[PDB]
Amino acid sequence: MAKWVCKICGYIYDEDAGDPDNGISPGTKFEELPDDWVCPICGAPKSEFEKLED
């Protein structure tokens, strides 16, 4: 699945891994994350992520 980078800190949201410690099971697409989900490292909102693809 896709990877998304936080433009603030460099954390990678990997859809294959999810974010289970913050309530997100593996295989959750970025677009399916709750509107209130934030970067687990720096707290950046979803707006600050960019998908890693051309």
Author numbering: 0 to 53
Give the exact sentences the study uses for this entry.
In the current study, perdeuterated Pyrococcus furiosus rubredoxin was produced with the iron atom from the [Fe-4S] cluster replaced by the 113Cd isotope. Here we show that it is possible to use neutron anomalous scattering to phase protein crystal structures in a practical fashion. The present demonstration takes advantage of the neutron anomalous scattering properties of 113Cd, the availability of modern high-intensity monochromatic neutron beamlines such as D19 at the ILL, and protein perdeuteration to determine the structure of a biological macromolecule using de novo phasing in a reasonable timescale.
In the current study the anomalous scatterer was introduced in the metal chelating site using chemical reagents to remove the native iron prior to isomorphous replacement with the 113Cd isotope. It should be noted that this method may provide a useful complement to X-ray anomalous phasing approaches – particularly where structure determination at room or physiological temperature is advantageous. Experiments close to physiological temperatures can highlight structural differences induced by cryo-cooling, and which may be more representative of in vivo structures and their resulting functionalities.
